[PDB]
Amino acid sequence: FGAXAXVXWXWXWXWX
Amino acid sequence: FGAXAXVXWXWXWXWX
């Protein structure tokens, strides 16, 4: 979760 | 992975 990869920003799901 | 929770900074494992 958060900024990098997962749920959040960068990679996986969310944004970025 | 990264900043928030998981492997990286904030919560779970790594730092913060």
Tab-separated table of all heavy atoms in Angstrom, unseen atoms left out:
chain	number	residue	atom	x	y	z
A	1	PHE	N	0.818	-1.213	0.000
A	1	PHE	CA	0.000	0.000	0.000
A	1	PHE	C	0.863	1.280	0.000
A	1	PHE	O	1.891	1.346	0.675
A	1	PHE	CB	-0.964	-0.048	1.199
A	1	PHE	CG	-1.723	1.240	1.469
A	1	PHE	CD1	-2.899	1.554	0.751
A	1	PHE	CD2	-1.201	2.172	2.392
A	1	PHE	CE1	-3.571	2.772	0.990
A	1	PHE	CE2	-1.895	3.368	2.664
A	1	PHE	CZ	-3.069	3.679	1.948
A	2	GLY	N	0.410	2.309	-0.729
A	2	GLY	CA	1.032	3.633	-0.808
A	2	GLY	C	1.846	3.856	-2.095
A	2	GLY	O	1.457	3.401	-3.170
A	3	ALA	N	2.950	4.606	-1.998
A	3	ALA	CA	3.799	5.022	-3.118
A	3	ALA	C	4.954	4.030	-3.370
A	3	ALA	O	5.834	3.878	-2.527
A	3	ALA	CB	4.316	6.442	-2.852
A	4	UNK	N	4.954	3.383	-4.542
A	4	UNK	CA	5.892	2.350	-4.995
A	4	UNK	C	5.102	1.329	-5.838
A	4	UNK	O	4.862	1.557	-7.024
A	4	UNK	CB	7.033	2.989	-5.819
A	5	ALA	N	4.667	0.218	-5.227
A	5	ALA	CA	3.780	-0.770	-5.850
A	5	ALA	C	2.777	-1.354	-4.842
A	5	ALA	O	3.104	-1.528	-3.669
A	5	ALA	CB	4.599	-1.892	-6.504
A	6	UNK	N	1.570	-1.700	-5.308
A	6	UNK	CA	0.525	-2.343	-4.506
A	6	UNK	C	-0.838	-1.684	-4.799
A	6	UNK	O	-1.254	-1.598	-5.954
A	6	UNK	CB	0.508	-3.868	-4.756
A	7	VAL	N	-1.511	-1.196	-3.750
A	7	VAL	CA	-2.692	-0.327	-3.802
A	7	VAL	C	-2.290	1.113	-3.404
A	7	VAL	O	-1.974	1.374	-2.246
A	7	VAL	CB	-3.835	-0.928	-2.942
A	7	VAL	CG1	-3.365	-1.632	-1.655
A	7	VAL	CG2	-4.909	0.112	-2.597
A	8	UNK	N	-2.288	2.058	-4.355
A	8	UNK	CA	-1.801	3.433	-4.168
A	8	UNK	C	-1.112	3.947	-5.449
A	8	UNK	O	-1.659	3.820	-6.542
A	8	UNK	CB	-2.951	4.390	-3.774
A	9	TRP	N	0.048	4.602	-5.318
A	9	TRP	CA	0.724	5.311	-6.407
A	9	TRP	C	1.927	4.519	-6.962
A	9	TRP	O	2.675	3.910	-6.201
A	9	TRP	CB	1.132	6.712	-5.927
A	9	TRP	CG	1.813	7.561	-6.960
A	9	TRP	CD1	1.198	8.321	-7.895
A	9	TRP	CD2	3.243	7.703	-7.210
A	9	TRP	NE1	2.140	8.944	-8.692
A	9	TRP	CE2	3.421	8.591	-8.317
A	9	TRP	CE3	4.411	7.154	-6.625
A	9	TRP	CZ2	4.695	8.932	-8.809
A	9	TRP	CZ3	5.694	7.503	-7.097
A	9	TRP	CH2	5.838	8.384	-8.191
A	10	UNK	N	2.137	4.562	-8.285
A	10	UNK	CA	3.286	3.961	-8.972
A	10	UNK	C	2.842	2.731	-9.786
A	10	UNK	O	2.572	2.842	-10.983
A	10	UNK	CB	3.978	5.030	-9.841
A	11	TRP	N	2.771	1.562	-9.134
A	11	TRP	CA	2.487	0.268	-9.768
A	11	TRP	C	1.403	-0.555	-9.037
A	11	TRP	O	1.092	-0.329	-7.868
A	11	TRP	CB	3.809	-0.508	-9.910
A	11	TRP	CG	4.840	0.135	-10.796
A	11	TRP	CD1	4.665	0.426	-12.106
A	11	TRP	CD2	6.175	0.625	-10.459
A	11	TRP	NE1	5.786	1.053	-12.610
A	11	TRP	CE2	6.750	1.206	-11.634
A	11	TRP	CE3	6.965	0.644	-9.282
A	11	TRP	CZ2	8.036	1.778	-11.642
A	11	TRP	CZ3	8.248	1.237	-9.271
A	11	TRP	CH2	8.789	1.790	-10.451
A	12	UNK	N	0.819	-1.521	-9.756
A	12	UNK	CA	-0.314	-2.347	-9.327
A	12	UNK	C	-1.645	-1.639	-9.648
A	12	UNK	O	-2.062	-1.607	-10.807
A	12	UNK	CB	-0.223	-3.734	-10.008
A	13	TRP	N	-2.311	-1.084	-8.626
A	13	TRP	CA	-3.617	-0.421	-8.729
A	13	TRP	C	-3.623	0.936	-7.995
A	13	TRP	O	-2.902	1.118	-7.017
A	13	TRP	CB	-4.724	-1.338	-8.169
A	13	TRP	CG	-4.562	-2.818	-8.360
A	13	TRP	CD1	-4.719	-3.500	-9.517
A	13	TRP	CD2	-4.183	-3.811	-7.362
A	13	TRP	NE1	-4.497	-4.846	-9.304
A	13	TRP	CE2	-4.172	-5.097	-7.986
A	13	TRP	CE3	-3.853	-3.753	-5.987
A	13	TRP	CZ2	-3.867	-6.273	-7.272
A	13	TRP	CZ3	-3.570	-4.925	-5.255
A	13	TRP	CH2	-3.567	-6.182	-5.897
A	14	UNK	N	-4.473	1.871	-8.441
A	14	UNK	CA	-4.656	3.197	-7.840
A	14	UNK	C	-4.343	4.308	-8.861
A	14	UNK	O	-5.202	4.675	-9.661
A	14	UNK	CB	-6.070	3.325	-7.239
A	15	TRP	N	-3.114	4.848	-8.822
A	15	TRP	CA	-2.652	5.985	-9.631
A	15	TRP	C	-1.150	5.891	-9.983
A	15	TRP	O	-0.447	4.966	-9.576
A	15	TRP	CB	-2.980	7.300	-8.889
A	15	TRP	CG	-4.430	7.515	-8.558
A	15	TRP	CD1	-5.380	7.953	-9.415
A	15	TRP	CD2	-5.131	7.203	-7.318
A	15	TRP	NE1	-6.617	7.940	-8.800
A	15	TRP	CE2	-6.525	7.466	-7.507
A	15	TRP	CE3	-4.735	6.695	-6.057
A	15	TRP	CZ2	-7.478	7.227	-6.499
A	15	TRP	CZ3	-5.681	6.455	-5.037
A	15	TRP	CH2	-7.051	6.702	-5.261
A	16	UNK	N	-0.645	6.865	-10.751
A	16	UNK	CA	0.747	6.934	-11.189
A	16	UNK	C	0.998	5.996	-12.380
A	16	UNK	O	0.219	6.394	-13.492
B	1	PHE	N	4.727	-2.608	-1.599
B	1	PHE	CA	6.120	-2.164	-1.639
B	1	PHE	C	6.236	-0.627	-1.706
B	1	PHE	O	5.460	0.033	-2.399
B	1	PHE	CB	6.828	-2.851	-2.820
B	1	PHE	CG	8.219	-2.323	-3.133
B	1	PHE	CD1	9.347	-2.774	-2.413
B	1	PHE	CD2	8.372	-1.309	-4.103
B	1	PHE	CE1	10.626	-2.247	-2.694
B	1	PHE	CE2	9.655	-0.813	-4.417
B	1	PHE	CZ	10.780	-1.266	-3.696
B	2	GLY	N	7.240	-0.070	-1.016
B	2	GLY	CA	7.572	1.357	-1.003
B	2	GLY	C	7.092	2.091	0.261
B	2	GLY	O	7.131	1.540	1.360
B	3	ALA	N	6.687	3.359	0.116
B	3	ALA	CA	6.296	4.258	1.204
B	3	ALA	C	4.779	4.207	1.481
B	3	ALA	O	3.981	4.597	0.631
B	3	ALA	CB	6.767	5.680	0.870
B	4	UNK	N	4.396	3.751	2.680
B	4	UNK	CA	3.027	3.542	3.162
B	4	UNK	C	3.027	2.288	4.060
B	4	UNK	O	3.374	2.368	5.239
B	4	UNK	CB	2.539	4.784	3.941
B	5	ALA	N	2.670	1.122	3.504
B	5	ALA	CA	2.764	-0.175	4.182
B	5	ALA	C	3.175	-1.298	3.215
B	5	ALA	O	2.792	-1.283	2.046
B	5	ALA	CB	1.436	-0.520	4.871
B	6	UNK	N	3.914	-2.296	3.714
B	6	UNK	CA	4.324	-3.483	2.955
B	6	UNK	C	5.806	-3.798	3.240
B	6	UNK	O	6.204	-3.939	4.396
B	6	UNK	CB	3.397	-4.679	3.271
B	7	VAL	N	6.622	-3.877	2.180
B	7	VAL	CA	8.087	-3.925	2.214
B	7	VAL	C	8.659	-2.565	1.748
B	7	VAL	O	8.555	-2.214	0.575
B	7	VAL	CB	8.599	-5.142	1.397
B	7	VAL	CG1	7.776	-5.457	0.135
B	7	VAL	CG2	10.081	-5.007	1.024
B	8	UNK	N	9.256	-1.782	2.658
B	8	UNK	CA	9.722	-0.411	2.405
B	8	UNK	C	9.520	0.474	3.652
B	8	UNK	O	9.887	0.083	4.758
B	8	UNK	CB	11.212	-0.389	1.986
B	9	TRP	N	9.013	1.700	3.476
B	9	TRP	CA	8.937	2.722	4.524
B	9	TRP	C	7.512	2.870	5.093
B	9	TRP	O	6.536	2.823	4.348
B	9	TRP	CB	9.478	4.052	3.977
B	9	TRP	CG	9.486	5.184	4.962
B	9	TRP	CD1	10.452	5.439	5.874
B	9	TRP	CD2	8.454	6.190	5.185
B	9	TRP	NE1	10.111	6.544	6.629
B	9	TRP	CE2	8.882	7.045	6.249
B	9	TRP	CE3	7.189	6.460	4.606
B	9	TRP	CZ2	8.100	8.123	6.707
B	9	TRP	CZ3	6.405	7.548	5.044
B	9	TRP	CH2	6.855	8.375	6.097
B	10	UNK	N	7.392	3.091	6.410
B	10	UNK	CA	6.129	3.361	7.105
B	10	UNK	C	5.728	2.156	7.977
B	10	UNK	O	6.025	2.128	9.172
B	10	UNK	CB	6.261	4.664	7.917
B	11	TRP	N	5.048	1.169	7.378
B	11	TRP	CA	4.480	0.004	8.070
B	11	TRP	C	4.810	-1.343	7.391
B	11	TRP	O	5.177	-1.409	6.219
B	11	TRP	CB	2.964	0.222	8.225
B	11	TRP	CG	2.567	1.403	9.069
B	11	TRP	CD1	2.903	1.578	10.367
B	11	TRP	CD2	1.817	2.600	8.691
B	11	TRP	NE1	2.419	2.786	10.825
B	11	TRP	CE2	1.744	3.461	9.831
B	11	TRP	CE3	1.190	3.054	7.501
B	11	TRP	CZ2	1.088	4.707	9.795
B	11	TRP	CZ3	0.551	4.312	7.447
B	11	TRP	CH2	0.487	5.131	8.593
B	12	UNK	N	4.681	-2.431	8.160
B	12	UNK	CA	5.053	-3.798	7.784
B	12	UNK	C	6.540	-4.054	8.094
B	12	UNK	O	6.904	-4.238	9.256
B	12	UNK	CB	4.132	-4.801	8.523
B	13	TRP	N	7.391	-4.076	7.059
B	13	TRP	CA	8.829	-4.361	7.154
B	13	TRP	C	9.663	-3.333	6.361
B	13	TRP	O	9.195	-2.784	5.366
B	13	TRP	CB	9.122	-5.789	6.649
B	13	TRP	CG	8.080	-6.841	6.903
B	13	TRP	CD1	7.798	-7.422	8.090
B	13	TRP	CD2	7.153	-7.427	5.942
B	13	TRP	NE1	6.786	-8.350	7.932
B	13	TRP	CE2	6.357	-8.402	6.620
B	13	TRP	CE3	6.910	-7.236	4.561
B	13	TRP	CZ2	5.379	-9.165	5.952
B	13	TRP	CZ3	5.950	-8.011	3.876
B	13	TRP	CH2	5.178	-8.967	4.570
B	14	UNK	N	10.917	-3.107	6.780
B	14	UNK	CA	11.872	-2.207	6.126
B	14	UNK	C	12.329	-1.098	7.092
B	14	UNK	O	13.244	-1.308	7.890
B	14	UNK	CB	13.052	-3.009	5.541
B	15	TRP	N	11.699	0.085	7.013
B	15	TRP	CA	12.054	1.297	7.765
B	15	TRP	C	10.821	2.169	8.099
B	15	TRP	O	9.691	1.863	7.720
B	15	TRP	CB	13.114	2.092	6.972
B	15	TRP	CG	14.381	1.349	6.655
B	15	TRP	CD1	15.411	1.140	7.506
B	15	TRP	CD2	14.719	0.616	5.439
B	15	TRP	NE1	16.364	0.339	6.910
B	15	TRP	CE2	15.978	-0.032	5.637
B	15	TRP	CE3	14.075	0.410	4.196
B	15	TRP	CZ2	16.564	-0.853	4.655
B	15	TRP	CZ3	14.653	-0.409	3.201
B	15	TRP	CH2	15.885	-1.054	3.435
B	16	UNK	N	11.040	3.278	8.816
B	16	UNK	CA	9.997	4.213	9.230
B	16	UNK	C	9.236	3.684	10.456
B	16	UNK	O	10.111	3.562	11.562
